[PDB]
């Protein structure tokens, strides 16, 4: 039941093993390693796509 | 590549074309995606920086104090009573409220940790031997039997969850699932309570969260002792929707969102700069 | 039983720990989530959409709508200064209660490049150009347009397209700069000058308007989370 | 290009000058799926009767004007079969296509900000008093902002540099916004989907969003030019469906 | 808590000249603070309101002579210029952040017209036969023409001082020559009245180092 | 405006049921009430007939809008003998009544009793009559049958167990005194009793 994942290391032995003890999904620890993102819903919320090299109007 | 690491700066050079990366039109509501290579001559720089600290889990996932409950072992008035309730909400402290108000609809599993201290009340004498006190914190769901006073029938917790903490141990801690009625916590509810558009306005109507009754388990001490219970919240498994703009004017009331009228920023002398 | 030993750091309450904890309502049935539009997974998605800045924040214009309106007039001699401020996006009086400023005050360090988008708001028949310089802090803030043309600058020509973007670079000896900045991590100075003039046909008013924006590019980052020095309180709100 | 041509039901909109159509948070409005619903009754779906362009009342843009706000779906409560099916129901789920338009000249100047803020919980004009429901929004009237502090008794706070919600007015650009700059632009068009934390909600006890039009750069012209330039807002519901039939409301 | 040490300092002003009131707070200082003057006719006379830095709201009666500003932790009120008639007694009041409620009213000071300082002049007169049969004795002495109230008054009856049943009063400003005056009402018995021969009235000033002696004849008819 | 005019004044007994009525010109409700004993004013109630925190159990219903009846000072405990005010709160210009006091000290009427002083002297002749030991503090002092009401110095009376003392100093030259006739007249509001006394000449 053990799950081995990587550790938050620097940039140029590094694993950690967590085991869920309790029988609830809300009683687990934090998953701090979801860095995914998509800013296209706030920066470019347009219907017709605008390319940078093209003129805008 | 990996996920979350920032983009790079590709190298460029002197250009002379009909392309206009600089010019744009903000009337479309479209923020420009201008890479710094599109304006000047940049070098190839590898960016190893990450956006780990700016995720919603690392931004909200820290403990913050919410409510400071006071209750003693001898009743002297109706604010230092033998027991003390708290209508459970995240809007009474200022620093956690401004973080939760940055998004409209949130959805988090809560995590509550109490730190409970004590201090003898001021009197004419202090010498007494007392065993270590036991504090009881009973969650009351919305629509349950509330304890009217001490030694009540409803302090038995036949279905309510509760803790029993001896002074001097590790602080109590328990996790709470997401327990709204809808699909998200509404941090902003522009609307009324009744269908006639009257009654109470704001997000007060959707704050049906229960209560939290603090008391001592011990019958009495020799001399009266005041206790303080500080409640810390830590939202985990957070999913936030519809980001708001962060509130500028400071808060006034714990129910609604009223405010003084404030200026936009701090002032300065002039619009220019006057040194060489 | 199994012989354990309490290490230093036991029975403590660290504020930023991630430990498991026993649930209070076991086998709770949560309410199923739905596709709600506008989800955020990162604070830099909020700090990447633009927001206007109060460049005209001389007293008393901060508690009014004339804080964002930069006055632009037909000059009588070219090379004057339209405005100017320091590039401290967490401590300057201009860029700290904006959207990029109100996020970066929650953190202690920042990095990357910003985008100052300038949008004209005058008549359709008014023309003219501007010079928007950015001088890194070698020899102080520049004095005139000749002394600012040596730095990083763009010459925005107001025309059919209504708005240009000066993209400030990332020129620093440190990989991160503090928001409440000291003298070790100075960033630079932003000026904006009249290139030629503002010329008009007759029956057009003199005063025009330029709205400045601020954003972040695709390589912005923050670090070292804190609490913001923007909201204070004495007691609990009741 | 600049030319757009919107058509919904039997009432179209033709604009020679436009910027682009910002669509919500990047999603087109659609009906409720079978795995997100909570009701069990079969909903009604009038597609030509409700999903059409309704033109609201006109407002006047002068030099010393502060701004205006409409609250939806209260501003469409008396317009056609949209406001008649609103009274005979309990739940509603619509998306919108807000089309604000203002033409002056090639000699005028000015700039608006057409934004749609979901859950615009407004602060009161005076604190420690709940206010009247007719001072947030009426059935068709455009409630206006002010330049100074509103020392009212049963109204909202209409400080234009605070936008009624206590936030600085500059940071309203996170919400789906467009600028009507009279130098280039003429009309702003936004397509905003149904944004709520529940699948379907009542339409009288909950104003979903608030269309705000705020002049940032004030309007200047020569005195010889035409001094009356209006701002007309035509809003069209989109993908409307209703549930929970009932008698006539609304109380 | 909530301590207001309002409102130093005003003594005394010239008609047409300036003074600067002040008020301090120690509770939640970013409130909706204002002022409230008062004169003993009631006569409300509200004068100013400010919230929170800008938006000063002077009244229509005095719209161009006051000025309030803050802060911090204290706030002032400058007057240019005072004119008689004027209050009186000035109070520093507060509210919460809405809020035209006026709670939290602290103590306050006074300010009046400008005169030269003048010593109080006391004079005593023979009584009538209206207090004889009742067993009492109401000896009459009316002072005249003093300013300000930094004086002293005494009742030395032929070398015998009386503090039992004495009466003290201070009038407001009379409108013929801007004078002030006090009164005297005594309550003696029968056996103590005729023990003396001529009652003596004295009053001191801060300028004069000696009281004024006035003698009347009781048995004169 | 025009506030109010509240009437005023109240009356004994503190057994209960005291009412204070006012009028207005608009003003749909924003009225308050304020009372003071010897200090700066207190504050009850709020911008309604709703209660305040810290005030006593008397919380009066006030009708809407321009009548606001009443204070409803039920079950007095003789602490509340004070002077009440009533603000309106619709700028411009937020002025009060400012009502009338209510102490009034049961029960007897106490018609007026005077002890007139006769001056006997110098270049000025000062004259005043000692209205002594009266219950009702309202009076109306009239000198020289309605001609010498200019130099009258109205003095504060002092309470020592239901007795008051007003005195009105009038100053004449020696062109009338001691030849002509001088007499102070008191029009009495509460009991309507007439006093007339002549200064004896030497
Ligand atoms: C005392 C034994 C442990 C039980 C602890 C108490 C359980 C209650 C936890 C509260 C659950 C969160 C409810 C929502 C909180 C805020 O009001 C929302 N953000 C506003 O709707």
Author numbering:
A (entry chain D): 2 to 13, 24 to 68
B (entry chain A): 9 to 284
C (entry chain C): 1 to 238
D (entry chain B): 11 to 261
E (entry chain L): 1 to 221
F (entry chain H): 1 to 120, 125 to 206
Paper text:
Echovirus 30 (E30), one serotype of the species EV-B, has emerged as one of the leading etiological agents of aseptic meningitis and caused extensive seasonal and periodical outbreaks throughout Europe, Asia and South America in recent years.
Tight bindings between the antibodies and E30 are chiefly due to extensive hydrophilic interactions, including hydrogen bonds and salt bridges. Atomic structures of E30 in complex with FcRn/CD55 reveal that FcRn inserts into the viral canyon depression through primarily binding to VP1 GH, VP2 EF and parts of VP1 BC loop, while CD55 lies outside the canyon, adjacent to the “south wall” of the viral canyon [see coordinated submission by Wang et al.15]. Patch 4 expands our original understanding of the nature of the antibody-epitope interactions in EVs by unveiling an unknown fact - a relatively blunt antibody can insert itself into the canyon and possibly seize the essentially conserved residues for receptor recognition—hitting the bull’s-eye for abrogating virus-receptor interactions in the process. Theoretically, epitopes in the vicinity of or inside the canyon have the potential to elicit antibodies that cross-neutralize a specific receptor-dependent group of viruses.
